[model samples]
Target: MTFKLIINGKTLKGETTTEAVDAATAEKVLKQYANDNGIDGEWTYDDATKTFTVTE
Candidate 1:
């Protein structure tokens, strides 16, 4: 499985995994990516969810 982290209007990072990821880990990973890209906002993740939301 692959996961993507999007911040604002751009994709900040992604990861490939052989197994599925739980919500907590997913959120952690996405948040890390967002931090790396200097994005400050709320973040959520679910192995079964796919979408992007941004706020200014």
Candidate 2:
């Protein structure tokens, strides 16, 4: 299974595995991606779908 990460409604990364992503994992990835690419907003994780989203 793959977990998705979305930023500003765009898909950022989608290669993260189920074993690699949960709430905490998603949070770390979201925050790091935001900081690394100079993005800012709120990030959320959907446990059911394993989707991480950042939206303004």
Candidate 3:
């Protein structure tokens, strides 16, 4: 299982995941999302738990 961006109730669910294998991919995914959506935020990834959180 990989990691996905989740933001509901300030919680990240790992039971469901994406195809991100490392921090680079995770960061890239979030960055691309922001770029495509023309929105920005503080995206953080913690490998310890394989969760990516966004704070806007």
In terms of TM-score, the best-performing candidate is 2
Residue 32 in model 2: lDDT: 75
- How would you encode candidate 1's per-residue C-alpha lDDT over 1-56 as one tens digit per residue? 44555455444433322222554555566566556667776554444555333442
TM-score versus the correct structure, for each prediction: 0.46, 0.59, 0.58
Model 3 Cα lDDT, one tens digit per residue, 8-51: 32332212245766767766765565456554456567878777
**Which number leads on lDDT?**
2
| Model 3 weakest 10-residue run by lDDT | 7-16
Which scores higher on lDDT, 2 or 3? 2
Model 3 TM-score on a 0 to 1 scale: 0.58
Tens-digit per-residue lDDT, 1-56, candidate 2? 35666766354432233335456755665567566776666767787876777785
Q: Which candidate do you rate higher for lDDT, 1 or 3?
A: 3
After TM-score superposition, what is the CA distance of residue 56 in candidate 3 from its true location, in Å?
A: 0.6
Residue 9 CA displacement from its true place in model 2, Å: 6.0
**lDDT of each structure?**
0.49, 0.60, 0.58
Better TM-score candidate (1, 2): 2
State the weakest 10-residue window (summed lDDT) of model 2: 10-19
Report the CA-based lDDT of candidate 1 relative to the real structure.
Answer: 0.49
lDDT of 3: 0.58
